Design an enzyme around this catalytic site. Structure first.
Site, PDB file in Angstrom:
ATOM      1  N   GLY A   7       0.828  -1.192   0.000  1.00  9.47           N
ATOM      2  CA  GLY A   7       0.000   0.000   0.000  1.00  9.47           C
ATOM      3  C   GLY A   7       0.864   1.244   0.000  1.00  9.47           C
ATOM      4  N   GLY A  12       2.187   4.783   3.720  1.00  6.79           N
ATOM      5  CA  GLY A  12       3.066   3.735   3.236  1.00  6.79           C
ATOM      6  C   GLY A  12       4.282   4.323   2.546  1.00  6.79           C
ATOM      7  CE  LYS A 180      -4.519   7.060  15.488  1.00  7.14           C
ATOM      8  NZ  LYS A 180      -5.649   7.529  14.640  1.00  7.14           N
ATOM      9  NE  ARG A 257      -8.391  13.451  -0.453  1.00  6.31           N
ATOM     10  CZ  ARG A 257      -7.771  13.698   0.697  1.00  6.31           C
ATOM     11  NH1 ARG A 257      -7.444  14.943   1.021  1.00  6.31           N
ATOM     12  NH2 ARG A 257      -7.473  12.702   1.520  1.00  6.31           N
TER      13      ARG A 257
HETATM   14  N1  LIG Z   1      -2.194   9.161   5.779  1.00  6.06           N
HETATM   15  C1  LIG Z   1      -1.830   9.222   7.182  1.00  6.06           C
HETATM   16  O1  LIG Z   1      -1.286  10.203   7.618  1.00  6.06           O
HETATM   17  C2  LIG Z   1      -2.152   8.047   8.134  1.00  6.06           C
HETATM   18  C3  LIG Z   1      -1.702   8.109   9.408  1.00  6.06           C
HETATM   19  C4  LIG Z   1      -1.969   7.105  10.272  1.00  6.06           C
HETATM   20  C5  LIG Z   1      -2.699   6.017   9.847  1.00  6.06           C
HETATM   21  N2  LIG Z   1      -3.161   5.954   8.589  1.00  6.06           N
HETATM   22  C6  LIG Z   1      -3.903   4.807   8.205  1.00  6.06           C
HETATM   23  O2  LIG Z   1      -2.989   3.974   7.174  1.00  6.06           O
HETATM   24  C7  LIG Z   1      -3.807   3.383   6.282  1.00  6.06           C
HETATM   25  C8  LIG Z   1      -3.541   3.930   4.894  1.00  6.06           C
HETATM   26  O3  LIG Z   1      -3.770   5.347   4.932  1.00  6.06           O
HETATM   27  P1  LIG Z   1      -3.363   6.239   3.697  1.00  6.06           P
HETATM   28  O4  LIG Z   1      -3.737   7.691   3.991  1.00  6.06           O
HETATM   29  O5  LIG Z   1      -1.885   6.136   3.421  1.00  6.06           O
HETATM   30  O6  LIG Z   1      -4.246   5.685   2.459  1.00  6.06           O
HETATM   31  P2  LIG Z   1      -3.900   5.840   0.834  1.00  6.06           P
HETATM   32  O7  LIG Z   1      -3.284   7.186   0.517  1.00  6.06           O
HETATM   33  O8  LIG Z   1      -5.198   5.654   0.045  1.00  6.06           O
HETATM   34  O9  LIG Z   1      -2.835   4.708   0.494  1.00  6.06           O
HETATM   35  C9  LIG Z   1      -3.240   3.357   0.409  1.00  6.06           C
HETATM   36  C10 LIG Z   1      -2.655   2.796  -0.904  1.00  6.06           C
HETATM   37  O10 LIG Z   1      -2.770   1.486  -0.972  1.00  6.06           O
HETATM   38  C11 LIG Z   1      -3.300   1.168  -2.471  1.00  6.06           C
HETATM   39  N3  LIG Z   1      -3.839  -0.149  -2.520  1.00  6.06           N
HETATM   40  C12 LIG Z   1      -5.073  -0.664  -2.234  1.00  6.06           C
HETATM   41  N4  LIG Z   1      -5.043  -1.989  -2.448  1.00  6.06           N
HETATM   42  C13 LIG Z   1      -3.786  -2.317  -2.875  1.00  6.06           C
HETATM   43  C14 LIG Z   1      -3.240  -3.539  -3.232  1.00  6.06           C
HETATM   44  N5  LIG Z   1      -3.745  -4.907  -3.302  1.00  6.06           N
HETATM   45  N6  LIG Z   1      -1.983  -3.618  -3.614  1.00  6.06           N
HETATM   46  C15 LIG Z   1      -1.205  -2.470  -3.665  1.00  6.06           C
HETATM   47  N7  LIG Z   1      -1.744  -1.266  -3.311  1.00  6.06           N
HETATM   48  C16 LIG Z   1      -3.036  -1.188  -2.919  1.00  6.06           C
HETATM   49  C17 LIG Z   1      -4.204   2.061  -2.591  1.00  6.06           C
HETATM   50  O11 LIG Z   1      -4.646   2.304  -4.016  1.00  6.06           O
HETATM   51  P3  LIG Z   1      -6.182   2.526  -4.313  1.00  6.06           P
HETATM   52  O12 LIG Z   1      -6.727   3.774  -3.555  1.00  6.06           O
HETATM   53  O13 LIG Z   1      -6.385   2.711  -5.829  1.00  6.06           O
HETATM   54  O14 LIG Z   1      -6.976   1.311  -3.821  1.00  6.06           O
HETATM   55  C18 LIG Z   1      -3.455   3.333  -2.064  1.00  6.06           C
HETATM   56  O15 LIG Z   1      -2.643   3.815  -3.009  1.00  6.06           O
HETATM   57  C19 LIG Z   1      -5.199   3.744   6.714  1.00  6.06           C
HETATM   58  O16 LIG Z   1      -5.718   2.744   7.499  1.00  6.06           O
HETATM   59  C20 LIG Z   1      -4.996   5.060   7.564  1.00  6.06           C
HETATM   60  O17 LIG Z   1      -6.143   5.250   8.436  1.00  6.06           O
HETATM   61  C21 LIG Z   1      -2.888   6.961   7.708  1.00  6.06           C
END
Ligand SMILES: NC(=O)c1ccc[n+]([C@@H]2O[C@H](COP(=O)([O-])OP(=O)(O)OC[C@H]3O[C@@H](n4cnc5c(N)ncnc54)[C@H](OP(=O)(O)O)[C@@H]3O)[C@@H](O)[C@H]2O)c1
Ligand SMILES: *SCCNC(=O)CCNC(=O)[C@H](O)C(C)(C)COP(=O)(O)OP(=O)(O)OC[C@H]1O[C@@H](n2cnc3c(N)ncnc32)[C@H](O)[C@@H]1OP(=O)(O)O
Ligand SMILES: CC(C)(CO)C(=O)C(=O)O
Lengths: 300, 303
Positions: A7, A12, A180, A257
């Site tokens: 991800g 990530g 959390k 979004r």
């Molecule tokens: N962003 C932050 O600051 C933050 C902080 C703490 C915790 N979190 C948590 O971390 C998790 C991810 O957050 P995020 O903001 O980073 O989300 P994000 O920006 O949408 O990143 C997730 C990535 O994983 C991709 N993905 C989905 N299925 C996949 C697969 N089989 N193989 C490869 N890639 C895949 C997604 O693409 P698609 O959208 O096209 O499916 C997306 O690009 C969440 O649970 C969030 O609550 C985030």
């Protein structure tokens, strides 16, 4: 350490970039556009720190097992993402989730006993393919799931810390995932339904009061499940708000979004778990329905 | 019948207009803008029916006691209204509240024993001064408050029906007030938070489901208080949503005008009574806080 990040979105990419800068063997697994950007021009981090790295990137997990698989997809993607990456889960591979929501670690446990749970208060946003904003620095907590310790969790923590990912080890990972989730239930629920900044939840004394009631609701469910807390969810809630006063929560941002939210794995899971042990989580249930309804209304 | 309608908002104007069309001696007591519009251009109803009538209108209570005083103001103004009208409450004047919420009849009983409780599921919106949109054609139920019967209640119901206000008499008015309060807790809560027409609450199956849970919560509170229902509140809910599906609920209307809302007298009353008998009313409590939070956010703003 050989690390695959499953991800390569916001968080990530941030974790992957920091781990790569520190010299770990990192592969980012994610969207074609992200993989192509990184393979072409590398991965750029800006904001809290600024640097460029070029880890490996692919759309599909290699068969060669890493020491560590980090789950960084949205919670609604976990089940499928694991199905698509299971080829890389070796006999000695550990899986760490740093995802919000509940149940991700349980999904990983289907594939291996070597699972850790994690929570991070780092903030990140992928603003362009290959360019991630380190929006805010925060602590990361990891531990053997659901509880206890293991030498490898300790190693991961050292690797993280050496890369500049401030990390503490807990022997109550499940307590942290639930703490959390309870904090998210309040912030991502109230802030979204009212479309207000996180700070407003503290400034309106009635919102402050209902926040306590929502949190207590989640805490009681946890307790009935035999879950205990290392840090009080209420303390985490107010600390989290104090630090993110001017922010709009990530669920609200998702809706604005046109992206799917994670509330099925926050409010939804608290509700489902409550029912399984003869309780209700009525405030969580109402927030769940309101947020999902708001989404449907906007989409259409 | 000589009838004063106290409160010249959407529902007061609707009732006043219908009663005036039927030939009753009707005076509307309300705010300057509405009063001036009615006196100048009459009162125009459109939507469910289209007609115009010219009842009397005034910002001051007439000296002569009416046969019937109808409380139609928003519940946060009930005390102000009764004070404005106190001199015209004669020995034989009855006061009927057709207001949303709980407790309005109890306030009226401080002035006179001649009080009837009323529920109406009509939906209306004042779109311009003197112009009321009848958005949903509902039903009306009135009765001696809190229970029992009186010949004059029957007479008022007869007058209402003659005027095209479909009305039945109940000997359990307090139960009906609670049934409507539970209905409004669902509609004015969910519809206001989501900012949708009433019909959407039945259209979305997930909103439909949570509506049942909210209604059940209110029913359980009512049962603990010893309230008995002649009508199932859930039936009243689905009936009301169908009859007013095109309406934006009155609480949402207030939010959009940056006004105070009535939710203290709907959700707030359910929660307060619940707490007095050792019960949480968690859904009502959350809705209460959400709507009041929206009230404060929107206060003084016209959207
Ligand atoms: N962003 C932050 O600051 C933050 C902080 C703490 C915790 N979190 C948590 O971390 C998790 C991810 O957050 P995020 O903001 O980073 O989300 P994000 O920006 O949408 O990143 C997730 C990535 O994983 C991709 N993905 C989905 N299925 C996949 C697969 N089989 N193989 C490869 N890639 C895949 C997604 O693409 P698609 O959208 O096209 O499916 C997306 O690009 C969440 O649970 C969030 O609550 C985030
Ligand atoms: S004591 C005798 C002298 N009068 C006074 O001293 C002043 C206090 N008394 C009164 O105002 C009236 O006597 C009472 C009956 C208390 C109130 O009269 P109204 O009921 O006619 O006036 P309201 O303001 O309460 O509401 C009537 C409708 O007017 C619209 N409206 C109110 N406020 C706004 C704002 N800010 N913006 C747009 N529209 C507004 C509403 O449509 C309201 O109708 P609703 O159907 O309730 O929405
Ligand atoms: C009957 C109904 C629900 C009409 O919307 C109403 O009472 C209101 O708007 O407050």
């Amino acid at each position: 350490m050989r690390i695959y990040v499953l991800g390569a979105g916001s968080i990530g990419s941030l974790f992957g970039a920091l781990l790569a800068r520190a010299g770990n063997d990192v592969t980012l697994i994610g969207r074609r556009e992200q993989v192509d950007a990184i393979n072409k021009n590398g991965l750029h981090v800006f904001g809290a720190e600024e640097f460029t790295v070029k880890p490996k990137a692919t759309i599909y997990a290699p068969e060669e097992p890493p020491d560590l698989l980090i789950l960084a997809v949205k919670s609604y993607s976990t089940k499928t993402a694991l199905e698509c990456a299971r080829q890389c889960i070796g006999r000695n591979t550990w899986v760490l989730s740093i995802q919000n929501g509940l149940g991700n670690e349980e999904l990983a446990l289907k594939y291996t006993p070597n699972v850790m749970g994690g929570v991070t208060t780092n903030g990140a946003m992928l603003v362009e393919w290959g360019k991630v904003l380190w929006a805010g620095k925060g602590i990361t907590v990891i531990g053997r799931y659901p509880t206890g310790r293991d030498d490898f969790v300790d190693e991961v923590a050292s690797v993280f810390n050496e890369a500049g990912i401030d990390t503490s080890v807990t022997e109550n990972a499940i307590g942290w995932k639930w703490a959390k989730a309870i904090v998210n239930s309040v912030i991502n629920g109230l802030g979204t339904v009212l479309e207000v900044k996180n700070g407003h939840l503290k400034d309106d004394p009635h919102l402050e009061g209902i926040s306590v009631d929502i949190a207590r609701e989640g805490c009681m469910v946890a307790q009935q499940l035999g879950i205990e807390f290392e840090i009080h969810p209420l303390e985490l809630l107010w600390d989290t708000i104090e630090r993110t006063r001017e922010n709009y929560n990530s669920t609200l941002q998702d809706i604005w979004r046109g992206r799917e939210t994670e509330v099925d794995y926050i409010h939804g899971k608290i509700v489902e778990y409550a029912r399984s042990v003869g309780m209700e989580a009525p405030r969580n249930e109402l927030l769940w329905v309101l947020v999902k309804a708001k989404e449907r209304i906007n989409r259409g």
